[PDB]
């Protein structure tokens, strides 16, 4: 199983400096050897074989070099230690013992399987054990994706190898927004090209004035001038591992686009193609042993009977017999989150005797069962003690697919281990939850019985399914297609949409609404919908993503969505929405599907995608609902990612050391002072095992950032209760002085960072919409990555302080005076403008999202005036359950301190031309998000099964429908936003004209 902790032994976080190790010799002798904690296995083996001469039967011992050590790890695995350079403290030993054996079996395969097991947090040998044929079929069949990707990487070597490892970090379009193009001097960019001249590695500066749309080769051509040369070189960003290897306009590269925007000087480095081409290892994939092993009918439409399922008994329930009256089994037949017929309950039985032996009859004809049909069930309790009032509560839930991965309808007897009810879920059924039995068998087990039809029942083939077997309305269809995914759809509209299903093809983006109009409990309507899906024109990827959420479970519908992504989703947008795409994998009925194949292919053909794909899957390996699926997926990724596996193992081991160090501070050393904790911190960090693991690896926040040597004098335990570690590394890039010299990251062990990760992603998407519309509202979506169960990394924003830090260094003018002192003379206006623009972005984003209340400690300001928010924690209607009030809060109220800055110290702050301009930025920002409401609703909808407590149902998403006033007109929505700002600030918010909203 996965490691209980990150400690050096079971029940011991750190080994003492010297430790007794029990060594089991192959002659049956036991030798106790005192070893140094950091000693390598080669040292220990040499020390052991010298000592073994002083023991009986020594003559039976072959040469020292003929053996390796084996031991039990904290994962309960018998691990063979082929790499004898490893230290005793890094072996993850369960107990301090080592057994001496002769190496047997496939050495190469065992070494790779260990490296994969380490990356994923679980031994790969656990998969070989699994009896489920769906699991063994996935392991074998996914290898075609692995093979396809690896060949495509070596196809045009070494360029295709360079494009894999260092893909172009580019925007989705070369088109420049007005305010960005106008920052250029007649469509021309001033760029600085640096050259490392050998043999003394001197830096030469070349200032080039070229067109913005100049392709990288053209930039090189000009550097020569200030024939043979043009084609022998490559461009790299100074200070990081980002390369310009593809023929894109220079301005389309995010670094350049960002440089134009910020009015910053782009600092590039020119180097020879071969200097990079040589450093790229030729990646090799090898077919695993399990791909070379000897493994281990009627149609549904001819079955003339209604659906029925027998509920036998449950092993037990955990209820207080004096508090609950009865228990029963609630069941339902679902297609997504939509029941296909009414829910059916068993009879109520005593708490102490969970036995039903009841056939439940469903209002559905067996041939009418759609392909993605699921049985959603739970054991519920009933308390009927006040009047005729009853309180029904779920005890445990479970979901099953009525058809398996081979299209076989469930039959005979089935035992299902039920799952605990998620925190906050009050619904009796959990249809959004995963399918299958709980791997933990020490849970209530519900015995079921499905019907037998004297044979194996199979879902009809596609050929059989394509049986055919049979002016103002244009404006109405255009209106329905523009509505948000969670807007109300009437039965009249459903009938209207189904009637015009063949004309719907002319407006392809109407498909999600048309699919919700279909009667999924009718094989006649579904067969017709299937024929339309097959020939349906492709929709935009941002629209296709909706068809991957928990509301669209149909494999043909999901198949269509994947094909739109394969054809139109750019690597930029895939990286942007990767968090959502990994999450919707949890909604997939089966392990093998088109979405998992598409994502794995992309992760194995672009290392930027691969890096975050690995960490998003790895971060959830602790969660038993997805552990097997994500483990199998990660195995296939690690088997084919090439050399990147070694870089990922370095990140994994550096993270494990940090988890262990913080566990010590939070557990054993919890009652010690900051001073005593800091002494232990510096001493432990200076050990060779720690220095080796925490230096010279890639940043998990950004793999283009190299983490060199630690600056230990800058490393510290923060004053917060969870004991966050502030860490500082040197940037080892030869031209680090041009980007940043210090890479600072906060490591936090204790808080769930998933909600903050999602908020920071949403902020980044909002900022991009704003920029692409001519609105320069600078946000600061700092890096945040969850790496496990309530463990993650936060990117430090340097030269920034909280409002409280500024105030403690006061009156309402302190903040403005502080900004004046930091931005003197001619740079003052730029600071006020940046504060104003950043304020407007944060004002709008926080109001739309309903994030946690702002105060002086969760608002930060950079020296240059850039304002930003930290520690989001909460979002949406997080105060509804707690206080029951029906309101849309304004978390970021612009107090006098903020108004004084915006108005440059004016007496009447709201009456200024500065405040009028600020209001206009807010109004435009708000309407820009409202116009893109579908994307945000879809992004939140794709996160419903993530397990975040504040994002559990479509009703939680309803909050954004209110803040964006989606049921109102654009004019009413703006009046609504102004009213919210006026109510929160006690007046001050104005506009131009009430009746038509024209200046």
């Amino acid at each position: 199983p996965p490691r209980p902790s990150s400690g050096e032994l079971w029940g011991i976080h750190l080994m003492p400096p010297r430790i007794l190790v029990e060594c089991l010799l192959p002659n049956g002798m036991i030798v106790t050897l005192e070893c140094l904690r950091e000693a390598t296995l080669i040292t220990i083996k040499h020390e052991l074989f010298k000592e073994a001469r002083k023991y009986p039967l020594h003559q039976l011992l072959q040469d020292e070099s003929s053996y390796i050590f084996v031991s039990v790890t904290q994962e309960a695995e018998r691990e063979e230690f082929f790499d004898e350079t490893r230290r005793l403290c890094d072996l993850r030993l369960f107990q301090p013992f080592l057994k001496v054996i002769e190496p047997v079996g496939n050495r190469e395969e065992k070494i790779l399987n260990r490296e994969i097991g380490f990356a994923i947090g679980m031994p790969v040998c656990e998969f070989d054990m699994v009896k489920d044929p769906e699991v063994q079929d996935f392991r074998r069949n996914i290898l075609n994706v692995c093979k396809e990707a690896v060949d495509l990487r070596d196809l045009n070597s070494p360029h295709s190898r360079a494009m894999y490892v260092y893909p172009p970090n580019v925007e989705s379009s070369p088109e420049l927004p007005k305010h960005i193009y106008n920052k250029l001097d007649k469509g021309q960019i001033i760029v600085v090209i640096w050259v490392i001249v050998s043999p003394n590695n001197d830096k030469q500066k070349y200032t080039l004035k070229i067109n913005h749309d100049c392709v990288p080769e053209q930039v090189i051509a000009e550097a020569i001038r200030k024939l043979e040369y043009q084609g022998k070189y490559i461009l790299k960003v100074c200070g990081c591992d980002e390369y310009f290897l593809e023929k894109y306009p220079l301005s389309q590269y995010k670094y350049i686009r960002s440089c134009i925007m910020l009015g910053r000087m782009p600092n590039l480095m020119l180097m020879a193609k071969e200097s990079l081409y040589s450093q790229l290892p030729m990646d090799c994939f090898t077919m695993p042993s399990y791909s070379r092993r000897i493994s281990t009918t009627k149609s549904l439409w001819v079955i003339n009977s209604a659906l029925r399922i027998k509920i036998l008994c449950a092993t037990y329930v955990n209820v207080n017999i004096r508090d609950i009256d009865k228990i029963y089994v609630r069941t339902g037949i679902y297609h997504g989150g939509e029941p296909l017929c009414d829910n059916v309950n068993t009879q109520r039985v005593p708490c102490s005797n969970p036995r039903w032996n009841e056939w439940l009859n469903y209002d559905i004809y067996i041939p009418d069962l759609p392909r993605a049909a699921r049985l959603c069930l739970s054991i519920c309790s009933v308390k009927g003690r006040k009047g005729a009032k009853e309180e029904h509560c779920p005890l445990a839930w479970g979901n099953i697919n009525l058809f398996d991965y081979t299209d076989t309808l469930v039959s005979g007897k089935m035992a299902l281990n039920l799952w605990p009810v998620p925190h906050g879920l009050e619904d009796l059924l959990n249809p959004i939850g995963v399918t299958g039995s709980n791997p933990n068998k020490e849970t209530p087990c519900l015995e079921l019985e499905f019907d037998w039809f004297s044979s194996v029942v199979k879902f009809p083939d596609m050929s059989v399914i394509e049986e055919h077997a049979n002016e103002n309305d244009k404006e109405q269809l255009k209106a329905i297609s523009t509505r948000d995914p969670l807007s109300e759809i009437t039965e009249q509209e459903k009938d209207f949409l189904w009637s015009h299903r063949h004309y719907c093809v002319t407006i392809p983006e109407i498909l999600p609404k048309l699919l919700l109009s279909v009667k999924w409990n009718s094989r006649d309507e579904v067969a017709q919908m299937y024929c339309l899906v097959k020939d349906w024109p492709p929709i935009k990827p941002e629209q296709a993503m909706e068809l991957l959420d928990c509301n669209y479970p149909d494999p043909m519908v999901r198949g269509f969505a994947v094909r739109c992504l394969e054809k139109y989703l750019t690597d930029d947008k895939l990286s942007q929405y990767l968090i959502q795409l990994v999450q919707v994998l949890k909604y997939e009925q089966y392990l093998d599907n088109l979405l998992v194949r598409f994502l794995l292919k992309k992760a194995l053909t672009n290392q930027r995608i691969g890096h975050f794909f690995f960490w998003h899957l790895k971060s959830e390996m602790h969660n038993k609902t997805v552990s097997q699926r994500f483990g199998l997926l990660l195995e296939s990724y690690c088997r084919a990612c090439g050399m990147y596996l070694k870089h990922l193992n370095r990140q994994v081991e550096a993270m494990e050391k940090l988890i262990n160090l913080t566990d010590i501070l939070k557990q054993e050393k919890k009652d010690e002072t900051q001073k005593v904790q800091m002494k232990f911190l510096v001493e432990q960090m200076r050990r060779p095992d720690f220095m080796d693991a925490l230096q010279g690896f890639l940043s998990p926040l950004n793999p283009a950032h190299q983490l060199g040597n630690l600056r230990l004098e800058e490393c510290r335990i923060m004053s917060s209760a969870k004991r966050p570690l502030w860490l500082n590394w040197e940037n080892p890039d030869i031209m680090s002085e041009l980007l940043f010299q210090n890479n600072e990251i906060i490591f936090k062990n204790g808080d769930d960072l998933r909600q903050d990760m999602l908020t920071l992603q949403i902020i980044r998407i909002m900022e991009n919409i704003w920029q692409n519309q001519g609105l320069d509202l600078r946000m600061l979506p700092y890096g945040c990555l969850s790496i496990g169960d309530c463990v993650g990394l936060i990117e430090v924003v340097r030269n920034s302080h909280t409002i409280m830090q500024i105030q403690c260094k006061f009156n309402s003018h302190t903040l403005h005076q502080w900004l004046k002192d930091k931005n003197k003379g001619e740079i003052y206006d730029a600071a006020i403008d940046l504060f104003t623009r950043s304020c407007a972005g944060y004002c709008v984003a926080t109001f739309i999202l309903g994030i946690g209340d702002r105060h002086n400690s969760n608002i930060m300001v950079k020296d240059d005036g850039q304002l930003f928010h930290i520690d989001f924690g909460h979002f949406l209607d997080h105060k509804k359950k707690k206080f029951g009030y029906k309101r849309e809060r304004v978390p970021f109220v612009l107090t006098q301190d903020f108004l004084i800055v915006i108005s440059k110290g004016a007496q009447e702050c709201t009456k200024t031309r500065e405040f009028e301009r600020f209001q206009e930025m807010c109004y435009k920002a708000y309407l820009a998000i409202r116009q893109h409401a579908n994307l945000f609703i879809n992004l939140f909808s794709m996160m419903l099964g993530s397990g975040m407590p504040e994002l559990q149902s479509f009703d939680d998403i309803a909050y954004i429908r209110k803040t964006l006033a989606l049921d109102k007109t654009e004019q009413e929505a703006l009046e609504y936003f102004m009213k919210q700002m006026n109510d929160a600030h006690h007046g001050g918010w104005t506009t131009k004209m009430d009746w038509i909203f024209h200046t």
Partner: protein, 227 residues
């Protein structure tokens, strides 16, 4: 009375949740004139009522209507406000107790998993150490026989001393596993008790919130209106 005014789609969903077929209520359109919501096949059907019902010409089954049960049974605002304060105080206390119970539930469930993994590691360790006894036995027999016939007493004693060391270590590992199995057995029982406590608090917490929300709605209704 089935007419419910300016209540959201989400409020209707809560009122129609797990209800029988035919259950309905007419509310103000979400901004468009009136919406009829009918419970059919475990789903809430939205039927628009156009005004100039839902048929081609507006010539102006619905079995059970959701009517506007009085949870609040007080005369005046002061008594209602006093009761809201009492229910809200009990609610916040019970919510805090539930959160504390949930954290202990998670911690216990996690520690149970850690102990279960460690037991498997103990089982694998004990096997290795027993295999070592067996290895020592297979080799020892032929050498013990030789040293006895040769007359080396101190050599047989050395082989015996090492075997005793191996057996005492095995006994210590076995006893450590036995103690872990005991701690797991006691923690598994603690888990069931925490699950039971949470299964008792959950219905009471939901009823308390609903009553609090009802008294809040009464106060809003009786107080000075318009916004």
């Amino acid at each position: 009375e089935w007419y419910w005014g300016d209540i959201s789609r989400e409020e209707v969903n809560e009122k129609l949740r797990d209800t029988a077929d035919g259950t309905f209520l007419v509310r103000d359109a979400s901004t468009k004139d009136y919406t009829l919501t009918l419970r059919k096949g475990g789903n809430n059907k939205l039927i628009k009522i156009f005004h100039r019902g839902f048929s081609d010409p507006l010539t102006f089954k619905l079995l059970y209507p959701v009517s506007k049960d009085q949870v609040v049974k007080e005369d005046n605002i002061e008594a209602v406000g006093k009761k809201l304060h009492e229910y809200n105080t009990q609610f916040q206390e019970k919510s805090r107790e539930y959160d504390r119970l949930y954290e202990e539930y998670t911690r216990t469930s996690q520690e149970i998993q850690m102990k279960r993994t460690a037991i498997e590691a103990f089982n694998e360790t004990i096997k290795i150490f027993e295999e070592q006894c067996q290895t020592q036995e297979r080799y020892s027999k032929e050498y013990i026989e030789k040293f006895k016939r040769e007359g080396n007493e101190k050599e047989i004693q050395r082989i015996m001393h090492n075997y005793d060391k191996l057996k005492s270590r095995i006994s210590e590992i076995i006893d450590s596993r036995r103690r872990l199995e005991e701690d797991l057995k006691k923690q598994a029982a603690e888990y069931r008790e925490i699950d039971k406590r949470m299964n008792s608090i959950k219905p009471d917490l939901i009823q308390l919130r609903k009553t609090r929300d009802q008294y809040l709605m009464w106060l809003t209704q009786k107080g000075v209106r318009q916004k």
